[PDB]
RNA sequence: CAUUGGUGAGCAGCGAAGGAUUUGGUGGAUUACUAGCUAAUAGCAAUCUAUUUCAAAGAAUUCAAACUUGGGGGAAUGCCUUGUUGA
C-alpha cells in the first residue's frame, strides 16, 4: 500500500539519440529523456528502467547476448544495466562528449567514439560479481583530426572503423598483430562522413557522407589497395544526410534526411527500393534488425518513433509522444487506458501495458486543459482554450457536440455529471460556471457568484452536488438538480486551486496557495482537518534565478490533488519537483517522490554548482546556439517572453519541471502523474516486500505447504494470506480443486476479502486460466456478496480489477465462441447452391 | 501563431464558426494510430446514419418515422383523417 | 567463509596507515600512491581525487611502495607486485621465507631487500620490456659488513651502483658484477631514514638521535651535519625548486624546514600528524614545485605550500612560513556507530573513537567531510558553558536520522558516551545543531530515535524516562515513564500513531502517540540490548541476552519469529529494505543472514575481525560493516539484487525449489475439465481476427517511389510433388494416417499470425475435401484437450472467412458433416463459460452499483 | 582572399562582382590563409594535410 | 498612563587559563572517482631531430548553395535576371 516504485514512463516514445533493437526482433529500446525504455513489439508489454540518467541520453547499446545495456549522457556519464536483473551494475564517467557506443558482434568488448578518440574497452563479465573498477580498457586510438561522429564493427570481432567530422574514415584492427592487415585511411568526401560500413564479405567498404555521396571502396588494382570503384549520389536538394545504417546481410542503406525523408538502396546496384516522407522534421536515428526487416526511425523535434517494415510496405508503429506539453489526465473506468491532453490540441489515448497511443483526437485548434471520463467509459469530455468543450465517443471516435459559451470564453477546467446529463466548465476570463446539457448543446445556465476565476470543478458521484474552487479564497458548493438552486460558500485562507472529491461524496479536498491541503465536509460547512505541505515540497532553483531555492514562492503549493478510491490517501503534485502521498486520517505523508533528476530541465536542483557562476552570469545562460554546425540549429526564433507557449524552440529557456495533473488508477494501487518528461506511472506490481498480517510463530512457508499435503484447504489459503506473498498464494490458489471451491470461498474470513479480490483481479488478466478463475469469482460473489455491498469503497479498486478482466478478455472469448456458434448454425442448416 | 506565443498562450476565442464536414464509413480500427491493438471494432458511421426510414417513393404508401408503413388503400377514412392531421401539424411547425 | 549473498566492494574512508607513500610523475602531473592494509590506493596530486584502487586484496599487508612512471611496485610479504592501473599484470615472487622490508627501482633492475639482510636483483629481460622480470642474482650483506638494512637508494649517475644504507654504515653494490665497490665508515648513531639529494653524489641520512648527516659518496665523507633536539627523524626531502630547502620529518609529529644556504631553520610545523600513530611517516617536496606532501600514520594526507616571498628585493631571506593546502581525511580510530544518510546511498555518517564524526561518501571519494563541531551562538543571549581549550565531543554510541525535513532544521540526533544530554546535528550544513537534548532524570542516553515526520526527537535515558523533544525549538513536550531500568531502544511507526520501547528489564512497551495512552505492554525473558524497527511493515526485531533475535509485530502485539543460532552477544543488526532479511553480527565473529518467512539463517559469514555494526542501504544494493580493528568501513555488494537466493538453513552444516528460490511458475492447466488460454500475449486472438483491417491502416498514405530496375527475386536474394509440399500439410497428412493431431496443433501454436492467414487459405480442397475434413478433426481433437480454447476457435472461425463459401455450397456432404457434427458434439460443452460470464457480469454490476 | 570548401582561394574586389582570379590551392576545404606584407607571397593550409606557398604576382605555386 | 521609538547608566541570570559583531584571501565540495603529453595498436615524460621523407589512397551537381531580409512606396547610377548588338 505504501511502497510505490517507478514502474513505467508513458508518452515521449523517443527524445534524443540512438535507437536499437534486441538480439531478436522483439525488444525495442528507445531513449526517453533519461531512461532506456523497453518496448516489446510481439509480447505486448512495456518497461522502463528505474535509474535516472543525469542528462539526456546520447547513445545506447545492447549486448548481443541480451544482457548488458549502456546509456550515455550528452556530457559523457555512463551506466551499466543488467537486463534480466533490471538494475545498475556500474557508473562510469567518460570525460568528453560521446557520439556512438556499440558492442562487439562477439559481445566481448565494446567501443566508444568519444571526442576525437576511439576507445576500446573490455566489457565486464556478467556472472562475475560487481567490483570497484570493472572496466578494463583495451586501447585508445587517436588518429583523427576533428570529432568522431559514428562507428561500426566488423562481422568478425576483429575490425572497427569510424567516421569523423574530419573527412577521414580509418580502419582499426583490434589486436596489434592485425595492424599490418589494415591501417589505411579512407578520405575524399566533401563534407562530414556520417557512416562507413562493411559488406557481408569484408572485401568492400561503403562510406556515406553528409553532402549526399556514397563511395564503394574495394581492394583493387590500378601492390594495390583501396580505390574508389564507383560513386553514388542521393541528390538531396537542400536535404542533407543525418543518420544512416546498413544491414550487410541484406544490403540496405536505410538513410535519413534533414527534410524528413528516407530512402532505401541495394549497394552494389544502388537501386532505390522505396522512398518515404516520415515527417516535416528530420530523421535523427535509424537502426535495423539482425534479420533486416524492421526499421526504426525517430525524429526528435516532435519526438516521434516510427518502426517500419520494408518488404510488406507497412508500419508496425508510427507513434508520437509529446514533451513539456501534457496538461491533464484521466484513467479510464477500465484500468487499461490513460487519456492525456496536450498543448498542441491532440488528445491521445495511451495504453499502460504496451505503451503506445491508440488514437489521436485532432479537432481542437489550441491547447486542451482538462479531460474527464463518464458513462462507464464510452464518452470522454475535454475543455480547451479554443473556446469550447467537446464531447467524444470511444466506440466511434467522433464528437457528439461541441459545447460553446455565449461570448467565446477560454475554458480551463471541467466537471461531468456521473449520470451523464450535465457538463460544467470554468474559465479565467469570465468566472462564471457555464453548464451544458449533454443532449441539447445549449448551455442550461450560467452559474455565477465567484469573485476571481474558477480553478477547478468536480461532482459528487454520490448525490451529484458539485463544488467549485475560486481564487477569491472560497470553495462554493453548488446544488443544481431539482427545484433547489441553493448555494453554500466555505471561505478558505488563500487562493484555492485544483479541488477533488472523495468517492464517498461527503468530503472535499482542496489545495490552497499557502501550501496547506484542507479537507472539508459537504453536508456541514466545517472542516475535518488540514495537512501541512509547505515544508515537504522540494523546489528547484532555476538557472536564471536570483533567489535561493529555500525562499522562492514558485512551487510550494499544489496544482493538483486526487483522492484514492479507498478514500484514505491523497496524491498531490504541482509546479514543483515532488509528488506526495498524504494519509488522510493520520494526516501524515507516506512517501515523497522526486519526479526527475535532470540538469537539462530547470526545476531539479535545490543547489546549483558554483563553478558555473562566472562574474558576469551563469555559464548555462550563454547562447551556444551559434556554435552549432548546421543552419537549422542556429536560427533562434524564440519570441521574447513566451512562457509555456507553442513550440519548444520558442522558450529560449530550458523546460521547467512541473507535474500538471495527477490521478490514481482505478484498479491496482497505481497512480499516474503527468510530468514535463512525460506521463509517469508508479505501481506495486513488483511485490518484492514482506508485508505480513497476523503471523504466529507456527506460520512458516514450510507450514502452509504441509497443509496442502494434508488437504486442509481453507487453512492453507489463510496461512498463505497471513504472509501476504504472491508465490505462496499462487501455490495454494492453483492447487485446490473445483469440488471444494464453494466450500472454501464462503469460509474465508471477512478480513482477507480485499486481499483475495485484489489478488484474482490482478492475477487473472495475464494468466491462461479463464475457466478456473471465473469459478472463483462465481464463488466469491455468490457466497459473500452482501458483505461487499456494505463496504463498497474498500473494494472499488478490487472489484474494478475484476470487471475489467471480464470485459477485456472474458467477453471477447465469448463473442468469438458465439460468432463460431452461429456461423456453424447458418452453414450446416441452410441450403446449398447450383 | 506568433501573437498567441507572445501573449503566453491565453487566447481570446473566435466569435462564430459554421462548417460542414464529410465522414467516410471505415471499420474504426482504421482511424487510430499505427499500433498493434485497438479499442473500437465497429464502423465509424452509426447504424442510424446509414439508414433513416424515409417516405416511400410510391404515392400509394406512407411510411412513418418509426417504421410503421401505411398504404393509402388499407386506411380507414377516420385514419386517413388523423394522418393528414398529423402531417398537418409537423409541416406547420416549420 | 565464502558468502552466497554478499561480496566486498571496497573499504571506505582510509587514506594512509604508516607505510611511506611514494610519488610518481606522469608528464608534468604527479600521482600519489598510498596503501591501506592489503589494498593500495592512488591519488592525484593536483586535486587529490581517488584515481585507482587495486583490483584484488593482497594476501598480506603491503610493506613498502614505489612507483616508476606507469607501474606501481607494491611489496607485500614474500612477493612484489608490479601493478598498472591497479591491475596485477605481473607477480614477482622472491625465493626466501623472509619478509621484504624495502624496495628500489633503477634502470633495467629491480632491487628488493628482505628482512634477513639479503638483497634480490631483478633484471628487465629486454630493454623493450617495461617491468623487470628475470631473477638476476642474490646480493647478501653479512653483519660484519653492516647492520640491518635501513633503506635502498639509487643515486643519480651511478652505473648499476646501489646505495644500500644500513643501521651502521653505507654500502655500494655494482649489481652487474655483484661486488661491493665501496663501503663507508661506521656512524655513531642508529640510522633511521635515508633520502638522496638533487646535488651530485650526496645522500641524506637520518638518525635516531636528532641528527641529519649529509654524506658524500665520491669523497666518502660527511659534508654537512644538522643537529635536532629530542627527535627521531622519520622522513627527509629536498625542495628542487631552485631554492635550497631540507624538510626533516620527526616521529614526534613535527615537520622541520631548513635553509641550507643560510644555515637556518625557517618554520617548524607542530603536530601536522599525530605523535602516537607515528608522526610524519613520509614527506616529499614534489619535483620542481613548492608543494610538500605529508602523510602520517593517523589516516590522513596533507599538502603544504610555500607562498612567494613578500620582499621584492630580498627574496630568499624573508620566507613565508608554509601554508595548509588540500588534504584527505579518515578516521584515525575504528568507528563506533554509523548510519546511512539518504535513500540513494550517497552519504554515510560515521562516528568513531577519534571523537570526530564524518560524513563519508559512497559515491565519489573526494566528497567526504568531517561534520563541523562549532557551537551555534545561543538564541537566549547568555554565554555557552564549556572549556575554552576546545576539545571534541565525547564519542558517539547512538545515532538517529530521519531525512524528511532536511535543510530547515536539525535531523540528526546523536547520543554521546557518558553524557546526560545528547546533541543534535544538521545534515545539510554539516554542523552540530543548535539544540542539545537533556534527559531530565540524570541518566545516560543509551538510545535515540526520530519521528518520520522529523518533528519529534526521542531520548531514552538509562533510568526509564523517554523524553520527547521537538525539533524546531528544542523544547520539551512529553515525558514517558514506563521502564525502570535503562531504555535501550525507541521507535515510532510510519503513521506516527504507535510507539514502542525496549528496556533492560525485559518490558517491551507499546505506546499510543496521538493520545498519550499506553496501548499495551509485553515482557520477554532476557534483557534487551537494541531494537531495529521497520516502518514499512510494522515489524521490529530485538536483540536479547539469551542470544536470540526476537521479531515482534507492532500491530498484533505478539512475537512472530524467534531466531536461534548465535553463540555470543549480538552487536548490531538491520532489516533488509523490504523486510525479507535480517543481517546480524555478533561476538562469535560471524555475520549471519536471517530469513523472516522461513525463520532461519541462509548464509553464515565467518570474518576474523569481529563486526561491530551492520547497516543496509535504504536502497537494495549495499551492505556496510564496521569492524573492531581497522579504520574504514567495509562495503558489501548485494548479489541478491542480481540473482535469486536459495533459502536453505545451510549454517548448521558449515558451523520445494518453488519455495527455495521463492518463485512459482503457474500450472499449464489445473485439470482436464478446465478451459485455458494460450501461453503468451492476449493480442494473438485479436490480430488473427483483424489481420486484414490492421494492415489496411498500417500502410502509408501514398505509394513509395520505386526504381524500375528491381530484382524480382529480391526476397530470396539475401546474401550470407509430396517432397515439394510444405511441412504443415505433410504433418497434417501423417497426422491423418494415425488419426491423431497432437503434434500438428503444437505447430499451429508456433506459427506467426502472418503465417496463419497464408496457411489456412492454402488448404487445396475443391472436389475431394480431404484437407478440410482433416483440419476440422484437428480442432475437435484440440477442444477435447481443453488447452488453448481461445486460439482453436479462432482457427475455426478463420476457416469460415476463407472457405465458408466452399463448405456452404458443399453442405450436407456426409464427409464434411461427419466432422461438423463431431464439432458440434464437442463445441456444445463450452457453453459453460458463456453461462458463467453472465453470472460473473450481472452480479458484479449489481454489487458495485447497487 | 576568401577560401571555400572547394579549395579555391578567390581574389575579390568591390568593383567587379565576379572574383578577380580563382586559385585551386588545396583539396578539401581551406583552414586558413595568410599573405606576405610585400604582396608577393601567399600561404594556404587546406584540410587535406597540406600547405601551399603561392606567388600572387604570377599565380604560380 | 502607554510606547510595539532612539540614546545610556546599572542588577539578577548565563559564565573552565575570555566574549560579540563585520570582513580580505586560499583550500574541499556543490552530478558518479579508470592518471599527463604527442604525429597515439606506440613512444616520450631529460626531446623529438642528422629516419620524418618516399610510396599509396585521395578532385560530382561537367561552375548546387542567403532555408537567415522590420513595413509601406521607389531604385537614376549599381547589381541580379532575361532579351539583344558586335568581335
PDB file of C-alpha atoms in Angstrom, chain C residues 282-454:
ATOM      1  CA  UNK C 282      56.738  10.385   4.864  1.00  0.00           C
ATOM      2  CA  UNK C 283      57.124  13.906   3.496  1.00  0.00           C
ATOM      3  CA  UNK C 284      58.144  14.820  -0.032  1.00  0.00           C
ATOM      4  CA  UNK C 285      58.607  18.034  -1.954  1.00  0.00           C
ATOM      5  CA  UNK C 286      57.105  17.460  -5.370  1.00  0.00           C
ATOM      6  CA  UNK C 287      59.687  17.906  -8.097  1.00  0.00           C
ATOM      7  CA  UNK C 288      60.447  21.491  -9.050  1.00  0.00           C
ATOM      8  CA  UNK C 289      57.339  22.787  -7.284  1.00  0.00           C
ATOM      9  CA  UNK C 290      56.742  24.431  -3.896  1.00  0.00           C
ATOM     10  CA  UNK C 291      54.476  21.632  -2.648  1.00  0.00           C
ATOM     11  CA  UNK C 292      55.391  19.269   0.174  1.00  0.00           C
ATOM     12  CA  UNK C 293      53.108  16.285   0.759  1.00  0.00           C
ATOM     13  CA  UNK C 294      52.919  14.959   4.316  1.00  0.00           C
ATOM     14  CA  UNK C 295      51.282  11.644   5.176  1.00  0.00           C
ATOM     15  CA  UNK C 296      51.309  10.340   8.728  1.00  0.00           C
ATOM     16  CA  UNK C 297      50.068   7.102  10.160  1.00  0.00           C
ATOM     17  CA  UNK C 298      46.930   8.639  11.638  1.00  0.00           C
ATOM     18  CA  UNK C 299      44.945   8.097   8.423  1.00  0.00           C
ATOM     19  CA  UNK C 300      45.418  11.466   6.780  1.00  0.00           C
ATOM     20  CA  UNK C 301      47.375  13.015   3.923  1.00  0.00           C
ATOM     21  CA  UNK C 302      48.040  16.741   3.713  1.00  0.00           C
ATOM     22  CA  UNK C 303      49.757  19.089   1.271  1.00  0.00           C
ATOM     23  CA  UNK C 304      51.629  22.214   2.336  1.00  0.00           C
ATOM     24  CA  UNK C 305      52.847  25.002   0.066  1.00  0.00           C
ATOM     25  CA  UNK C 306      55.237  27.920   0.243  1.00  0.00           C
ATOM     26  CA  UNK C 307      53.768  31.229  -0.794  1.00  0.00           C
ATOM     27  CA  UNK C 308      56.079  33.571  -2.721  1.00  0.00           C
ATOM     28  CA  UNK C 309      58.118  35.913  -0.579  1.00  0.00           C
ATOM     29  CA  UNK C 310      56.679  39.271   0.409  1.00  0.00           C
ATOM     30  CA  UNK C 311      60.008  41.023  -0.099  1.00  0.00           C
ATOM     31  CA  UNK C 312      60.688  42.491  -3.514  1.00  0.00           C
ATOM     32  CA  UNK C 313      64.461  42.746  -3.484  1.00  0.00           C
ATOM     33  CA  UNK C 314      65.389  40.360  -0.688  1.00  0.00           C
ATOM     34  CA  UNK C 315      63.562  37.203  -1.635  1.00  0.00           C
ATOM     35  CA  UNK C 316      65.359  34.197  -0.223  1.00  0.00           C
ATOM     36  CA  UNK C 317      65.743  35.580   3.300  1.00  0.00           C
ATOM     37  CA  UNK C 318      62.178  36.616   4.119  1.00  0.00           C
ATOM     38  CA  UNK C 319      60.499  33.257   3.547  1.00  0.00           C
ATOM     39  CA  UNK C 320      56.781  32.787   4.012  1.00  0.00           C
ATOM     40  CA  UNK C 321      56.039  30.025   6.519  1.00  0.00           C
ATOM     41  CA  UNK C 322      54.271  27.017   4.988  1.00  0.00           C
ATOM     42  CA  UNK C 323      50.585  27.044   4.366  1.00  0.00           C
ATOM     43  CA  UNK C 324      47.812  24.494   4.603  1.00  0.00           C
ATOM     44  CA  UNK C 325      46.526  23.299   1.277  1.00  0.00           C
ATOM     45  CA  UNK C 326      44.150  20.419   0.430  1.00  0.00           C
ATOM     46  CA  UNK C 327      44.029  17.175   2.333  1.00  0.00           C
ATOM     47  CA  UNK C 328      42.046  13.996   2.712  1.00  0.00           C
ATOM     48  CA  UNK C 329      40.749  12.664   5.992  1.00  0.00           C
ATOM     49  CA  UNK C 330      39.680   9.412   7.539  1.00  0.00           C
ATOM     50  CA  UNK C 331      39.080   8.040  10.970  1.00  0.00           C
ATOM     51  CA  UNK C 332      42.232   7.552  12.972  1.00  0.00           C
ATOM     52  CA  UNK C 333      40.295   5.169  15.237  1.00  0.00           C
ATOM     53  CA  UNK C 334      37.809   2.378  14.457  1.00  0.00           C
ATOM     54  CA  UNK C 335      34.206   3.524  14.003  1.00  0.00           C
ATOM     55  CA  UNK C 336      31.734   3.016  16.815  1.00  0.00           C
ATOM     56  CA  UNK C 337      28.370   3.732  15.249  1.00  0.00           C
ATOM     57  CA  UNK C 338      27.456   4.503  11.648  1.00  0.00           C
ATOM     58  CA  UNK C 339      24.262   5.125   9.717  1.00  0.00           C
ATOM     59  CA  UNK C 340      23.216   5.895   6.179  1.00  0.00           C
ATOM     60  CA  UNK C 341      22.099   9.406   5.395  1.00  0.00           C
ATOM     61  CA  UNK C 342      19.756   9.162   2.435  1.00  0.00           C
ATOM     62  CA  UNK C 343      17.806   6.875   0.155  1.00  0.00           C
ATOM     63  CA  UNK C 344      20.158   6.916  -2.843  1.00  0.00           C
ATOM     64  CA  UNK C 345      23.037   5.627  -0.643  1.00  0.00           C
ATOM     65  CA  UNK C 346      25.057   8.779  -1.133  1.00  0.00           C
ATOM     66  CA  UNK C 347      26.361   9.654   2.327  1.00  0.00           C
ATOM     67  CA  UNK C 348      27.279   7.720   5.443  1.00  0.00           C
ATOM     68  CA  UNK C 349      27.694   9.217   8.862  1.00  0.00           C
ATOM     69  CA  UNK C 350      30.478   7.546  10.778  1.00  0.00           C
ATOM     70  CA  UNK C 351      31.394   8.363  14.350  1.00  0.00           C
ATOM     71  CA  UNK C 352      34.496   6.843  15.838  1.00  0.00           C
ATOM     72  CA  UNK C 353      36.657   6.671  18.928  1.00  0.00           C
ATOM     73  CA  UNK C 354      38.673   9.537  17.412  1.00  0.00           C
ATOM     74  CA  UNK C 355      35.722  11.641  18.707  1.00  0.00           C
ATOM     75  CA  UNK C 356      35.037  13.204  15.285  1.00  0.00           C
ATOM     76  CA  UNK C 357      32.027  12.376  13.144  1.00  0.00           C
ATOM     77  CA  UNK C 358      32.470  12.081   9.385  1.00  0.00           C
ATOM     78  CA  UNK C 359      30.013  12.155   6.520  1.00  0.00           C
ATOM     79  CA  UNK C 360      31.743   9.771   4.151  1.00  0.00           C
ATOM     80  CA  UNK C 361      30.640   9.385   0.564  1.00  0.00           C
ATOM     81  CA  UNK C 362      29.962   6.071  -1.086  1.00  0.00           C
ATOM     82  CA  UNK C 363      29.584   7.831  -4.402  1.00  0.00           C
ATOM     83  CA  UNK C 364      32.669   9.982  -5.013  1.00  0.00           C
ATOM     84  CA  UNK C 365      35.517   9.571  -2.618  1.00  0.00           C
ATOM     85  CA  UNK C 366      36.671  13.186  -2.593  1.00  0.00           C
ATOM     86  CA  UNK C 367      33.285  14.340  -1.268  1.00  0.00           C
ATOM     87  CA  UNK C 368      33.777  13.188   2.326  1.00  0.00           C
ATOM     88  CA  UNK C 369      33.895  15.814   5.063  1.00  0.00           C
ATOM     89  CA  UNK C 370      34.102  15.954   8.815  1.00  0.00           C
ATOM     90  CA  UNK C 371      30.913  17.375  10.226  1.00  0.00           C
ATOM     91  CA  UNK C 372      31.949  20.546  11.980  1.00  0.00           C
ATOM     92  CA  UNK C 373      31.750  20.901  15.731  1.00  0.00           C
ATOM     93  CA  UNK C 374      31.321  24.630  16.136  1.00  0.00           C
ATOM     94  CA  UNK C 375      28.545  25.548  18.525  1.00  0.00           C
ATOM     95  CA  UNK C 376      25.863  27.976  17.441  1.00  0.00           C
ATOM     96  CA  UNK C 377      25.718  31.158  19.464  1.00  0.00           C
ATOM     97  CA  UNK C 378      22.659  30.933  21.682  1.00  0.00           C
ATOM     98  CA  UNK C 379      19.272  32.456  20.994  1.00  0.00           C
ATOM     99  CA  UNK C 380      18.950  33.239  24.693  1.00  0.00           C
ATOM    100  CA  UNK C 381      21.955  35.549  24.993  1.00  0.00           C
ATOM    101  CA  UNK C 382      23.745  34.082  27.989  1.00  0.00           C
ATOM    102  CA  UNK C 383      27.048  32.563  27.051  1.00  0.00           C
ATOM    103  CA  UNK C 384      27.742  28.912  26.372  1.00  0.00           C
ATOM    104  CA  UNK C 385      29.300  26.883  29.139  1.00  0.00           C
ATOM    105  CA  UNK C 386      32.373  24.970  28.043  1.00  0.00           C
ATOM    106  CA  UNK C 387      36.124  24.709  28.370  1.00  0.00           C
ATOM    107  CA  UNK C 388      37.969  27.397  26.457  1.00  0.00           C
ATOM    108  CA  UNK C 389      40.559  24.966  25.139  1.00  0.00           C
ATOM    109  CA  UNK C 390      38.125  23.353  22.734  1.00  0.00           C
ATOM    110  CA  UNK C 391      38.091  19.584  22.850  1.00  0.00           C
ATOM    111  CA  UNK C 392      35.989  17.330  20.690  1.00  0.00           C
ATOM    112  CA  UNK C 393      32.665  15.846  21.660  1.00  0.00           C
ATOM    113  CA  UNK C 394      32.755  12.538  23.557  1.00  0.00           C
ATOM    114  CA  UNK C 395      32.409   9.526  21.306  1.00  0.00           C
ATOM    115  CA  UNK C 396      29.046   8.695  19.840  1.00  0.00           C
ATOM    116  CA  UNK C 397      27.254   5.481  20.696  1.00  0.00           C
ATOM    117  CA  UNK C 398      23.738   6.061  19.359  1.00  0.00           C
ATOM    118  CA  UNK C 399      22.679   7.999  16.282  1.00  0.00           C
ATOM    119  CA  UNK C 400      19.332   8.649  14.694  1.00  0.00           C
ATOM    120  CA  UNK C 401      18.474  10.420  11.477  1.00  0.00           C
ATOM    121  CA  UNK C 402      15.265  10.980   9.564  1.00  0.00           C
ATOM    122  CA  UNK C 403      15.761  12.703   6.278  1.00  0.00           C
ATOM    123  CA  UNK C 404      12.289  14.090   5.735  1.00  0.00           C
ATOM    124  CA  UNK C 405      12.847  17.721   6.704  1.00  0.00           C
ATOM    125  CA  UNK C 406      16.447  18.429   5.850  1.00  0.00           C
ATOM    126  CA  UNK C 407      17.872  21.882   5.348  1.00  0.00           C
ATOM    127  CA  UNK C 408      15.260  23.583   7.517  1.00  0.00           C
ATOM    128  CA  UNK C 409      16.120  22.374  10.990  1.00  0.00           C
ATOM    129  CA  UNK C 410      18.124  19.589  12.572  1.00  0.00           C
ATOM    130  CA  UNK C 411      17.647  15.982  11.516  1.00  0.00           C
ATOM    131  CA  UNK C 412      20.449  14.072  13.273  1.00  0.00           C
ATOM    132  CA  UNK C 413      20.348  13.210  16.966  1.00  0.00           C
ATOM    133  CA  UNK C 414      23.458  11.671  18.490  1.00  0.00           C
ATOM    134  CA  UNK C 415      23.973  10.347  21.994  1.00  0.00           C
ATOM    135  CA  UNK C 416      27.485  10.725  23.275  1.00  0.00           C
ATOM    136  CA  UNK C 417      29.242   8.270  25.543  1.00  0.00           C
ATOM    137  CA  UNK C 418      28.570   9.125  29.202  1.00  0.00           C
ATOM    138  CA  UNK C 419      26.751  12.415  28.875  1.00  0.00           C
ATOM    139  CA  UNK C 420      23.438  13.267  30.470  1.00  0.00           C
ATOM    140  CA  UNK C 421      22.496  15.210  27.333  1.00  0.00           C
ATOM    141  CA  UNK C 422      22.501  14.230  23.668  1.00  0.00           C
ATOM    142  CA  UNK C 423      23.274  16.697  20.913  1.00  0.00           C
ATOM    143  CA  UNK C 424      21.735  17.352  17.538  1.00  0.00           C
ATOM    144  CA  UNK C 425      23.327  17.870  14.139  1.00  0.00           C
ATOM    145  CA  UNK C 426      22.169  19.403  10.888  1.00  0.00           C
ATOM    146  CA  UNK C 427      22.849  17.166   7.923  1.00  0.00           C
ATOM    147  CA  UNK C 428      22.924  19.721   5.135  1.00  0.00           C
ATOM    148  CA  UNK C 429      25.037  22.368   6.816  1.00  0.00           C
ATOM    149  CA  UNK C 430      27.473  19.708   8.184  1.00  0.00           C
ATOM    150  CA  UNK C 431      27.481  21.141  11.667  1.00  0.00           C
ATOM    151  CA  UNK C 432      26.438  20.488  15.230  1.00  0.00           C
ATOM    152  CA  UNK C 433      22.891  21.646  15.655  1.00  0.00           C
ATOM    153  CA  UNK C 434      21.937  24.472  17.907  1.00  0.00           C
ATOM    154  CA  UNK C 435      19.837  22.371  20.284  1.00  0.00           C
ATOM    155  CA  UNK C 436      21.052  19.953  22.925  1.00  0.00           C
ATOM    156  CA  UNK C 437      18.602  17.485  24.416  1.00  0.00           C
ATOM    157  CA  UNK C 438      18.621  16.672  28.138  1.00  0.00           C
ATOM    158  CA  UNK C 439      17.084  13.636  29.836  1.00  0.00           C
ATOM    159  CA  UNK C 440      15.695  15.414  32.962  1.00  0.00           C
ATOM    160  CA  UNK C 441      16.361  12.430  35.252  1.00  0.00           C
ATOM    161  CA  UNK C 442      20.189  12.404  35.308  1.00  0.00           C
ATOM    162  CA  UNK C 443      20.501   9.204  33.311  1.00  0.00           C
ATOM    163  CA  UNK C 444      22.835   8.455  30.464  1.00  0.00           C
ATOM    164  CA  UNK C 445      21.419   8.476  26.953  1.00  0.00           C
ATOM    165  CA  UNK C 446      21.539   4.962  25.570  1.00  0.00           C
ATOM    166  CA  UNK C 447      19.084   5.141  22.685  1.00  0.00           C
ATOM    167  CA  UNK C 448      17.602   7.846  20.475  1.00  0.00           C
ATOM    168  CA  UNK C 449      15.099   7.901  17.632  1.00  0.00           C
ATOM    169  CA  UNK C 450      13.318  10.462  15.474  1.00  0.00           C
ATOM    170  CA  UNK C 451       9.830  10.644  14.070  1.00  0.00           C
ATOM    171  CA  UNK C 452       9.428  10.013  10.360  1.00  0.00           C
ATOM    172  CA  UNK C 453       7.920  13.481  10.056  1.00  0.00           C
ATOM    173  CA  UNK C 454      11.132  14.827  11.558  1.00  0.00           C
TER     174      UNK C 454
END
